[PDB]
């Protein structure tokens, strides 16, 4: 899904009476406070401009676009949406500052609600301040600033007064028309490690496979898979995993794709497989796709039932936050008559506002996802 950003440049100088209007201006496109594209506007296009083929989302989040203009001598600038007004003001200008949050869309929810900055002149604080926050799209333009401080051009810069904890700060002071303050933060990470233990009399019957596939689930969603073999002594480790999602701590679990003739039991990150000729287990997990229940319509519990070859077996389970929305049944026959049985899950409880979809590809990892529509 792409987008288009269009606007125009309007002159407020009495029709260029003093004939001091430049031939063009340079407008900058900022994506969430970051300069990603510049463009020259002239009378060729009747001072109109357009940025097309723009990504509407980055990291699955809506991109907040804004425009700034590089400083024009003796002109003061005003930005209203995409409409840039430059009014002729001999000897005076404006200065624009935008705040760039480089912290992965606030993944760890550590971003403050607002920050204050102050404009400096040739190095001395001016007393001109600004409070940047969501309301003003983290931008602010100061007006009526002196270009010359007695026979010599003056340089303006910005400085962040607020001390954002955990963040680092860098300021871009190259053009007073587009000053940018960047606050960087590196999101926390974790790792999950475990082992698989075989309970088959040290492979008495040589039925043990060469490897198993363990799945890593993030809040019920499968995000990575590992083939575990004896090469690592049946030990696995998932590294550099994001610790939070939208300010919330991610609940990580593991499941194992079905192994022929073994009954799986999962305790934490320890996966145990017991040799049980003709019998296995089935594992279910509920996936809540509703932006971490921000709208608060998620039920506190649901019920699912096991089905073999399409018929209700009567084996049910209540999934909730206490058992991590996951359950494993044991004692399931792999064969009936001479053919292999098929196992699927059914969500019994119908939850309003959500649409359900069930993945029955592998009985060792059945996943019921509910999308908040």
The DSSP bridge pattern shows strands 189-199 and 270-275 to be parallel
Structure tokens of 121? 């002149």
Q: By C-alpha distance, which of 363, 328, 371, 367 is closest to 343?
A: 363
Structure tokens of 178? 């587009």
Supply the CATH classification number for the domain 1-90: 2.60.40.1140
- Kindly write down the DSSP assignment for every residue of 281-292, as one continuous string: EEEEEEEEESGG
Q: How far apart are CA 278 and CA 181, in angstroms?
A: 65
For residue 208, the tally of other CB atoms under 10 A from its CB is 18
Q: How far apart are CA 358 and CA 348, in angstroms?
A: 12
CATH number, domain 278-373, options 3.40.50.2300, 3.30.1490.20, 2.60.40.1140, 2.60.120.380: 2.60.40.1140
C-alpha dihedral, 224 to 254 to 242 to 301, nearest 10°: 120
Q: Does domain 91-187 have CATH number 3.30.930.10?
A: no
Q: How far apart are CA 214 and CA 73, in angstroms?
A: 64
Whether the CB-CB separation of 352 and 336 falls below 8 Å is answered with no
C-alpha dihedral, 276 to 340 to 265 to 215, nearest 10°: 140
Q: How far apart are CA 213 and CA 236, in angstroms?
A: 10
Question: Over the range 67-79, which residues count as b (16 or more CB within 10 Å of their CB) and which as e?
Answer: bbbbbbebbbbbb
Whether the CB-CB separation of 77 and 96 falls below 8 Å is answered with yes
- Residue 97 burial class via C-beta count within 10 angstroms: exposed 0-12, middle 13-18, buried 19 and up: buried
Whether the CB-CB separation of 196 and 257 falls below 8 Å is answered with no
Q: What are the sequence ranges of the domains in the chain?
A: 1-90, 91-187, 188-277, 278-373
CA 193 to chain centre: 25
């Amino acid at each position: 899904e792409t987008t288009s950003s269009i606007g125009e440049k309007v002159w407020d100088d009495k029709d260029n009476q003093d004939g001091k209007r430049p031939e063009k201006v340079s407008v900058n496109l900022l994506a969430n406070g970051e300069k990603v594209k510049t463009l020259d506007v002239t009378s060729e296009t009747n001072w109109k401009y357009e940025f097309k083929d723009l990504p509407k989302y980055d990291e699955g989040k809506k991109i907040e676009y804004t425009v700034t203009e590089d400083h024009v001598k003796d002109y003061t600038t005003d930005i209203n949406g995409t409409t840039i007004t430059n009014k002729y003001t001999p000897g005076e200008t404006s200065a624009t500052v935008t705040k760039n949050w480089d912290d992965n869309n606030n993944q760890d929810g550590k971003r403050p609600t607002e920050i204050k900055v102050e404009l400096y002149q040739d190095g001395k604080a001016t007393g001109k301040t600004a409070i940047l926050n969501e309301s003003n799209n983290w931008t602010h333009t100061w007006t009526g600033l002196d270009e010359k401080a007695k026979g010599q051009q003056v340089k303006y810069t910005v400085e962040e007064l607020t001390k954002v904890k955990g963040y680092t700060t860098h300021v871009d002071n190259n053009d007073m028309g587009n000053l940018i303050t960047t606050n960087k933060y590196t999101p926390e990470t974790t790792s999950s490690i475990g082992e698989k233990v075989w309970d088959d009399k040290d492979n008495q019957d040589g039925k043990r496979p060469e490897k198993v596939s363990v799945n890593l689930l993030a809040n019920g969603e499968k995000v990575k898979t590992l083939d575990v073999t004896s090469e690592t002594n049946w030990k696995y480790e998932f590294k550099d995993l994001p610790k939070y999602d939208e300010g919330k701590k991610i609940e990580y679990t593991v499941t194992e794709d079905h192994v022929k003739d073994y009954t799986t039991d999962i305790n934490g990150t320890t996966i145990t497989n017991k040799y049980t000729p003709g019998e296995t287990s089935a594992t279910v997990t509920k996936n809540w796709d509703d932006n971490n229940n921000q709208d608060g319509k998620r039920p506190t519990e649901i019920k699912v039932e096991l089905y073999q070859d399409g018929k209700a077996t009567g084996k049910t389970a209540i999934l909730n936050e206490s058992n991590n929305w996951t359950h494993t049944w044991t004692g399931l026959d792999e064969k009936a008559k001479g053919q292999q049985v098929k196992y699927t899950v059914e969500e019994l409880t119908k939850v309003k506002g959500y649409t359900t979809h069930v993945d029955n590809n592998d009985m060792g990892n059945l996943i019921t996802t509910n999308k908040y529509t």
